[PDB]
Every structure is written in C-alpha cells, then in structure tokens.
Write a protein that binds this ligand. Sequence first.
Ligand code: FES
Ligand SMILES: [K+]
Ligand SMILES: [K+]
Ligand SMILES: [Mg+2]
Ligand SMILES: [Mg+2]
Ligand SMILES: [Mg+2]
Ligand SMILES: [Mg+2]
Ligand SMILES: [Mg+2]
Ligand SMILES: [Mg+2]
Ligand SMILES: [Zn+2]
Lengths: 77, 291, 232, 50, 164, 190, 52, 115, 109
Amino acid sequence: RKTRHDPLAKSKIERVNMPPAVDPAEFFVLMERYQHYRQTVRALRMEFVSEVQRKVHEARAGVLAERKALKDAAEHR
Amino acid sequence: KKPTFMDEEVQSILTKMTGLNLQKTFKPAIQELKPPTYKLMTQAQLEEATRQAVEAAKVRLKMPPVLEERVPINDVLAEDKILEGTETTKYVFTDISYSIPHRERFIVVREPSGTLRKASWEERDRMIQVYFPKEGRKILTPIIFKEENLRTMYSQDRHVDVLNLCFAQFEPDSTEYIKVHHKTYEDIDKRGKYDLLRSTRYFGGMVWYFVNNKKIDGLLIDQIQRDLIDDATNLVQLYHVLHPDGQSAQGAKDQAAEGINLIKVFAKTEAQKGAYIELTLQTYQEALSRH
Amino acid sequence: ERGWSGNSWGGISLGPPDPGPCGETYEDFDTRILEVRNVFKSIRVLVAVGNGKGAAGFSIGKATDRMDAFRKAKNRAVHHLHYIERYEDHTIFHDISLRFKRTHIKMKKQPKGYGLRCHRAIITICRLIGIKDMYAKVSGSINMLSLTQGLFRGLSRQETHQQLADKKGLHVVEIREECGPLPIVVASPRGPLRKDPEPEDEVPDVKLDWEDVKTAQGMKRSVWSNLKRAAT
Amino acid sequence: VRPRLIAELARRVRALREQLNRPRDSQLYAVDYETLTRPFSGRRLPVRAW
Amino acid sequence: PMKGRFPIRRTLQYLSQGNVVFKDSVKVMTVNYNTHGELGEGARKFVFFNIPQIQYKNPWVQIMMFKNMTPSPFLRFYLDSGEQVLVDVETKSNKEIMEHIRKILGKNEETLREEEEEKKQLSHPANFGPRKYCLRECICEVEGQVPCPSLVPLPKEMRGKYKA
Amino acid sequence: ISPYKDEPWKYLESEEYQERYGSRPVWADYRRNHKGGVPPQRTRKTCIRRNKVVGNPCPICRDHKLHVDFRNVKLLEQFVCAHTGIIFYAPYTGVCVKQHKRLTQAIQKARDHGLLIYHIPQVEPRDLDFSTSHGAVSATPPAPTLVSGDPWYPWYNWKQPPERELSRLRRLYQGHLQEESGPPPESMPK
Amino acid sequence: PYPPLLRAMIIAERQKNGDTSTEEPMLNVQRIRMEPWDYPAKQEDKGRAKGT
Amino acid sequence: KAYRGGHLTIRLALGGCTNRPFYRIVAAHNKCPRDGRFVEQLGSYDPLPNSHGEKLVALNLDRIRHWIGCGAHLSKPMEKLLGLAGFFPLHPMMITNAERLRRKRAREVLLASQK
Amino acid sequence: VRSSVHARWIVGKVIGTKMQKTAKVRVTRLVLDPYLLKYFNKRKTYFAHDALQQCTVGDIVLLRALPVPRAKHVKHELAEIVFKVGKVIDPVTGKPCAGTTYLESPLSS
RNA sequence: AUAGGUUUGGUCCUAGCCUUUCUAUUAGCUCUUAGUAAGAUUACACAUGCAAGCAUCCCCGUUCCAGUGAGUUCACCCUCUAAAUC
Ligand code: FES
Ligand SMILES: [K+]
Ligand SMILES: [K+]
Ligand SMILES: [Mg+2]
Ligand SMILES: [Mg+2]
Ligand SMILES: [Mg+2]
Ligand SMILES: [Mg+2]
Ligand SMILES: [Mg+2]
Ligand SMILES: [Mg+2]
Ligand SMILES: [Zn+2]
C-alpha cells in the first residue's frame, strides 16, 4: 500500500465521494437493532471478562490451590 | 433386582466361562517385526513371567459393557424464522474445547429454515471423528459392514475380526454396533462356532445375548462336547438367575437339582432341543465312566 | 543369466559338483563363482558350494585353463564343507562382529521377511548356506578371500540357544513384541537347572559400535542407506 | 553498541521546531467557502457537511 | 568401537533412563566423594553412572563434584528457600542413593503425569496447520469434504474461470 | 484377448500357470536392467505405451493373463509380505508404477471387501463414561420465547418507526433519499 | 435472554452440578447505559493536526 | 514484535487452494498479515458443502470466551458465524439482509403474477 | 519476582580477592557435548560482594543473587563459605579434617 | 553404502580420485491436453499508469499490508514496567 509520502494520483484529484441514499424506515429500524445488539454483546463481554478474572483469582490465592500448596509444604517438611 | 451385565457375580461367571489361552490371546500378529530379545531365566523367573503374562491377558480380555440402543436426539434450541431461506445448506457447529467428554460436548445444527437444533447421534459421531480422530475409525461407514461382506467374513471364520472392526467403528450403544454384534452372534449360533470367541473379550457379550434371548442350547451342547461341564452348570445357573420365574428354575428348586442335574432339569423343562442335550450329556457321562 | 554384472564372472553358477571318487553324488549342491583372477599365465578361481540346508564350503582352484580351475575348485570345495547353524532355518542365532586380517564384518540377526541386505558376495554365500534374513556390513579392506574366510569362520563359530542353555544351565526365553508379554522358551538345559538367578547387571560393560548408536539415535544421515532395492 | 546520537539530535530538533511552529486554529480550521476546502492542507470537506 | 569403558553411558537412551526429576526448589547439588576406600564405593559408582542421568533430566540444576575433601562421601542440595539438605551416602549403593534422593527431593509420578497431560493440551488434534504442529494441513484431507484441486479438479461450475 | 478376464482367479488354478511359474511368485525371475550397483529408486512409469510393450516388461505386463482384480486374491497375495502384511514397494518386485498403483488399489479393495486377510487391532473405547444424561445429548428446557412462538429477541422483528422520526430522517437526508420501505414479508416469498 | 446456545450450555452445566431450579438465566443490562453516538466526546483526549 | 497500538482480534485466516477456500478462526494482532502470525487457533470453517451437504464450523468456545474476556475484538464475519451458532444474538445485518431478500423475492413474485 | 539476576544460587571456588569487598569466584556447570554425549565442565566467573573480606583464594563458597546488581559485574553476594581452604569441617560428623583424615576423632565427643 | 572402478611383472595393506542414488538452476535437442503449486541474476538505473482513504468539518488512518536480503548474534527466557485492547 502507499505510504504518507507517496503523492496522490492525478486521476483522483477531482474525486468526490457522494454519500449513499438513505431508506428512512430501514435506517431507523437498523439503528435500533444495532443499539440492542451492542448492548447485549457488551453484557456478554462483561460476563466473559468476569469469568476470566475469577479463574485467575481461583488459580492464584484460591482455596483448593491453597490446600495443594499447604499439602506440598507439609510433605516437604 | 435382576443382575446387570456388569454385576460382580455375572462378571466372574462370564470370565470363568470365557477361559484364558495365552497362546490364542497373544497370537503372533502380522505387523512390522523387530529382532526378538532373549533372557536367561530360572524356573521361578519363568513362572513369574508367565504370571505377569496372565495378568496382561486378563487386562486384554476385559469384557466391553453391554449398552441399550440409544434414544434418538430430537431437540430444538431455537426457531429463528427470519433466517428461513437465507441459506441453502445446513451449518454444523461443533464445540472443540479439549477437556470435555465427547458425550457432554455441544454439537448443534442450523438448518436452512432457521432452526437451531441439537445434532443427531450419527452427526455427533461423525463430527467427533472429524475433529478428534480415533485410530481404527472412519468418518464414512466402511463397506465391510454390508451384509454380503459380513457373510464373506463369517464364511472365512473371521467373526472376531468383524467384532474388532465393529468396536473400532461404532459406539457400543449405537444401532449399527448392536445390529452387527447380533448378526455375528446369530451366525455363531447357527454354525456352532462358539470356540472362535473363547479366550476373547466378546465371549461374555455373546453369552449374555444367548441367555437373554433364551437360546443357550447350542452353547450347552458345545460345552458338554468339549468336557467343560463346569461351564455348562455355570451357564444354567446364570440362566436361572436371569429368569428366576421360569419353569426351569422352579423345577431346579423343586427337585433340588445341582451340578449335572441342573443341566438335566433345563433340558427337560425349557430347552428347544432338550433331547439332544440329554443325548450329549449321556454320552459324556458314559465316556467319563469308561475313562 | 548374468552374475553381479554383465561382464563379471562373480555370481555365475557352475552347476552341481561332480560325483566324487568317494562314490557320493552332489546333485543337491549348487556352486557359485566368487572371484576370478589372472595369475602372472594361469587362472585362480575362488568358488563356493552349498546345498541350501546349512552345508556349505569354498575353495580355490588354480590352472592354465579356466574350466579346469572351475572343476578343481568345485571338487575340492565339496570335500571341505562347513555346517552352519541356523535359527529357525532362516537367520543366524545372534549378532556376529569379526575381523579377519584387515576385513571387518558385522552381521545382525533379523526377523523373517527382512531379506539379505548384505555385500553381494555375502548374499551369494548366504543363499548357498540357506540364510534368508540377515544384515551385514563390511569395513576395512574388501578382499574377497578374506571376506569369505571371515564369513565362514564367524558363521561356524556361532553359539546356538541350546548351547547357551547347557552352558549357563538356564531357560533361554524369547520375548517378541508381536507376541506381547508371552514368554517363549526356545531352549532348556539338558542337565539340571540352576536355582540361583543370573546377576542383574545394572549396566553391562559391552563394546558398542558407534555406527549402530548413530543409526538408533537418528544422527545417521547417509543418502545411501535404506535405499529401495530388488528382492534378494 | 555504537551510539546513534544523530537520531536523538534530530528528534530533539524536530520536537522543538514543532513546538515553536505550532499552526494556530485560524490556520488549521480556515475554509474556502467557494470550494469548501481547507487552505492549510487542501483537503475537501465531506459532502454531507457542505 | 565406541571409546571408553561403559560406552552405554554416552547414549541418549541411557541418559533418559533416569527417574529423578527434582522439585523446583533444588538449585545446586554438590557431590563430595573419595576416590579410594571401600565404604565410598557406591558413591563413586553414583558419580560414574548416575550423575549424567540426573543432569540430563535436570539441565538447570548446578551439579558440582569435590574429591577427597572429607573423610566420608555425602551429597548436599541447596534449595531456593535457603534450606540445605545433607544426605550421607557412606556404605550405600548407588541405586540406594538414587532412590533416596528421588524419595526426598524427586517429583512423584503423579506430578509428572499431570505435567505430561498439560503438555498434551497444547497440541489440539482439531487444529489445522503445518505438520510440525498439526496432524493435518487442510480440511480437504478429511474424508467426505471437498478434496484439494491439486489432486481432483473441481467441477467447472465451482471454478471462477467458468463463473466469469 | 484372455479367456480369464471375467474370472481371473481361474488362471492361477490352471495348469498353464503352474507350468509357467510353478509355486514361486510371478515376479521371482524378473530382473531390472540398469546401470550401476544401486538401481534407480523408481520403476518405469509403464511398460505399455500406446498399445506397444517395451523390451523388458515388468512381471504384470509381461503376462496378459494376469489381471489385477480385487477378486484375484491369490495373485494380490504375492505382492504383500506374508510376515508383516505390508505391500512391497515397486523396486522390490520390479512392477512398473502404473501396475503398482493398480495393485495397491486392488489390495485395498480386497481388504475392504473382506476377501484379503489382514491384521485388525483390538482398540480401546473412545469414552471412559457412557452417560447420556448431559444436556448436550438430552433435552434442554424450552425458552419462554420458543414456547410462545416469538423471536428470541424482540428486535428480530420489524417495528414501523413513528412518523415523527421518519420525518426527522427525511429532513436530515434532503435530496439523498430512497423510497420508504414498508414492513417486510412475514414469510419468505416462494 | 441469553443467546440460545449459551443458555443451553448454562442450563446443562447447572443440571450437571445438581442444581434443578427452573428459573431462566438472564443477562443484566441495567449497567449497560447506551450513550447516543452523537453524545459529546472528550476533547481533552483528542489530537491535533500537525503543521505541514 | 512491537506494533504501534493495535489489539487482539478473533478473525478468519484464509487457506486452501484456488477455488477451494477454507478458513481458520484465529485470535491474532489486528495489524498482522491475514495468514501470518497468530496467538491461538480458535477453530475452523469449511464454506464448501461436504458430501452430506454440510458446512462444518469448529469453535473452541472455552478459548473464545477466554480471549473475549482478555480484550480481543471480533471481525464481522466471525460475529455472523457466532450468531448462526447461537452463541451471540443474530447480527443486525443478517436480519436486515434477510428482509431485503424477502422484499426482492416478493417483487419478483409480483412480476411473475403481473405477467 | 524476588530478583532480576538469572543465577539465584550458585556454588564456586574463589579465584581472586584483589578487589575491595569483592571476591572473584569460578563456577563450573556440566554441559553435554552434543556429539560425544559426555558431560564436560563449563566455567564462568562471578563477582560476589564480600563486605567482611573473609574470602580467601581457593575456598568453596555459596553465592546468592542480589535483588539488583550493585555494580557492572557484581550481581551476587557471599551467602556463606561452604569449605574454608585448608580448614574444612566435616558436615556429616562436624569434626575438623585434613582431606580424608579426621583431625579430631568423632568418638572424642 | 550391500557397495564398485582405478596404483603393481604380481600379492597384500594404506590412500586419494571417480562410478552408481536424490534434488535445484542453466544449456543443447525435443515438446500435445487439463488441474494445481512455484516463478529478475543484480540493495544497478528507471519512461508510463495505478498501489490510502474515511467522515457532517475535529480527529482517526496513510507507523499497517506489500517488498528486499544490503548489513548483521536488536529475534529467545526471566525481572521490572511504558504505550495499546477490555
Ligand atoms: S491443501 Fe487443501 S485445498 Fe489444497
Ligand atoms: K475518520
Ligand atoms: K543479507
Ligand atoms: Mg553389459
Ligand atoms: Mg579405492
Ligand atoms: Mg505482493
Ligand atoms: Mg514485514
Ligand atoms: Mg550479504
Ligand atoms: Mg497502560
Ligand atoms: Zn509393467
């Protein structure tokens, strides 16, 4: 791809990006659908993040892991 | 309650009936060969090695569990009618998380109609083979299990090979597994080839099938002709415990039949060919008296 | 049929040995030429004979005419026969490492179907003796006469399993991977059996060959080893 | 490691020259109302803003 | 042949036959032994036969030998916690020394099995990739799926050249 | 033209075959012509080119009555090691590459049809536990939406916007407007 | 509601762990406050065009 | 390798051969090449129907959950795949495209009736 | 987590004491020769802080990693002297010894 | 390496060179169809056309992808800890 130092092509200097036409009813319904979907997906992402953090906390400073550590230390002694 | 196939007494009876031939259990395999090793051993060392080989054979002869035919999976998780007609083929989604038992792993199908349903048993097994390949299994069913090729294998007396192939390919509770095992048992019964399964792990299942279908006459005849009288008496006792309300068991209790008398009671009460059972038993007794 | 090469005498059959003056017939013995040399002129020929059932021998014949040298070598070979012990009549009883003069020969017992992956002269002599499965490597000077002498010497000095049992007074038990943990007793002492076990040598003080260790460890990289070849 | 001091020198000089020649809002956000371009860069504004 | 007495010691099979995998606490192992004296015989054998195996299974543990410095042979282990473990080995056979150090500072079979099962999880059989890491490279190697175009030409309707 | 084409195995039980080969394998007497002591590591691609046989045809191509058919079990057996159950590589017997491929396919088909005996291992069960009580294979309680016939989420369905919001959109997108879309067909049109 | 498959997995795990309660699993969305896309952003974090 | 900014994203890496695509679901740095270095392979997707008329999708749901909880983003095709699997809500564009196709086929059916 | 120095505990022989409060110590590890599959000693030099200057050339010492290096080459400190050169105390019996011989009999106590 | 040829009037030993095997590039001569993979010799010089936009203005991106192998133990592990995602 081009770098920021490469010049713009001379056949695109007069290029104007005309925005697409909008269907009002579809536009409104799609906006609502995205809003609801993104809300649900953030909720799911929050649950997954909490699961990851809880697994890490169960691995370090857990309870069964704590028992394992104490058992190994007593075995060594 | 009625003993299960995995009951300890049942397992012991079937283990003793199976027998243990170290030569047949560890028959030389046709595979890549390596130069053999040699050891100098005393008599005690040789006996210890033979005992260890016996333990290994016992591990090898562990009878597979006998399982009832699985119920078809017909469960729908969702019906998204909006997706109807947007796709032409079904999507199969398999969860491939490693540390999950294969019977607890979620495998679902999104159909073209938009229905998200659970995968059927055959689809489940195909997917598990696709992503967790198992040696000896195939994604597409081999053609050896067709009736003509199974007939050829039976003709060559390769029933144990058929059962090994079936065990490798099909799940114990699957319809195909049960059907193939039942055909093998039926052919063995029809042609008197029970000895082919002796000292193998399939003998117990064959015996269980015969007892549950009330067709132990041929096996009793074979055991009598091979002078395995203890096996015949144990088979009669197993039949009576599995059918404790049958006229044979009641006759045994009434006459207090034990040992060979149990066989005589079975032959007189509930044998389809009890006359030939009596003839073979009489010949065995006469030969024993002569010997 | 040609021998080892198109223009080579080696490997060519000379037919059964002549009926001897002793009154014996040798229709069951096959003769093979191992070497032909010009002596400066006369001809010196090294030939081997064998019946395929353990009885084999070799001899040198010298004469001005090549056919006379062949006949002399063959007739003298039949009267100097070795008997070679064979394990199950297809291979040798154990690995043999020998050095005759400057020729080293390392022979390895092999399972059935392994074939004769050996020096071509060794292949010919093994076909005469009746050995069907063996590996052989020749190092040092490849001298045909020394090779033949060393081969016959090593094959004649192999200890059978019965001999080992009688010497050590113990059961010789074979372990085959294809047969699982089943112990196969191949030989038992003819006399009484010792009740004390052999010392459980934790590390034997054996002389290992670097080539075998390299092959086992995968550090051998030769482009010439394990090449596809015709049945032997 | 052979130190690359010219790199640090150029970085410092560029930082100073950027902090001393800061373009002001009047230069950055001026607009040519005839062509609707930024004279500072020459980039046209999006159509929906015109 | 291979040089030296007991050349089997210099084979990977022998080196891997060791059964002592130290716990992570162990960092240094000093071996004080005497070159002569019957009572130290096993220790000498321990140095001759088992130190290579112990080192091979424990590459990051510093093993260091000392000769004829004390009247009797002994082993000393230095642990990460600063604790030191002294094992007297006089009159003991090399096998006995190996078993003792395995018992007191060697990982048990259960821990090793857990570690092996952990190693198994990294190589997921369902993953697709180069043969160095994965069993299969492409889904086309799975029976019933569409095969590779290299081996079986695709139907013309499925090729872009005849869809354009 | 061979009379044994339909029933190839008959040829191996015929006296002509016994006279020609005896009890030895059909490839016993074949020898490849090559330079050097080490042969090329592949056999020729084929012995028959455009219905013309090369000078030294391989064992299969030199006899036209030998048919590589999966029913011709006794012939295929001669190309498998009886002690290890492995198919010989082409240089071993000297069969050309084409006939070697045909022999391999025939041997595989014979093994698949149970006509050729091969070693079948005894394998262990796939699963340690055979329970089918987990929800993955059992029935999951239907969700209320599934029971009521509604979509899983309310927004899966079309909701006509209010007129005011549509009017804002029409004001916002002056001159760049498409025709307003009504509610979609309830079912997929056929 | 949870998505279909996720809901099924949650219920399956519950039933495996002995729980037999018949309550539906539900995702709390009270803490998910949907800000409109045109809500003002933080200008303090925004960049600035570089002189060129 | 240090990238300026960027993040982990779960996306589809394209392999296979010409006219035979195949996808690997991988978590990787967004700036990396499509078929280059990745952090973990999270599944696969065969878009060609097999002999059973099935498009096979393998999903490592545990690791997918782990990487989402570790801050990884998702490409749109992966979001649509997970919506089809039932793991997420159906993406808005799947519903919108279904409605668009419904209206298009309704127009075609009305054309047929008109003729 | 406790130190940025790679070698946490090492044992060595003091080979130099010419630096103030610093002992130059030689540490030997066993390295496998890839070709010969034999273990050979590989040596490395370490500087250990000896605040009390109690180390002598030839004694066997234990070095413990510093939490952070105190100099360019000083990343360790002298934890203890395992064997004082010529002044060995038998760890097994606790008695003075000169090589393989007891200077004081164990029975005496 | 399963080895072979070649020193001498001749034998044995030592020793080099070469042969046989498998790849890659180029050259000669010869080449029909289909699918797939791979594809400057040169960190020498370059005509020409394209390879970076998006977006209600701010920002963001153009620091990526793509290329080459000139230079060359900056790549790996641990400790500590910025920037970045959640
Ligand atoms: S390797 Fe699978 S399509 Fe080519
Ligand atoms: K922008
Ligand atoms: K370079
Ligand atoms: Mg010639
Ligand atoms: Mg030479
Ligand atoms: Mg490119
Ligand atoms: Mg790059
Ligand atoms: Mg260079
Ligand atoms: Mg930060
Ligand atoms: Zn041919």
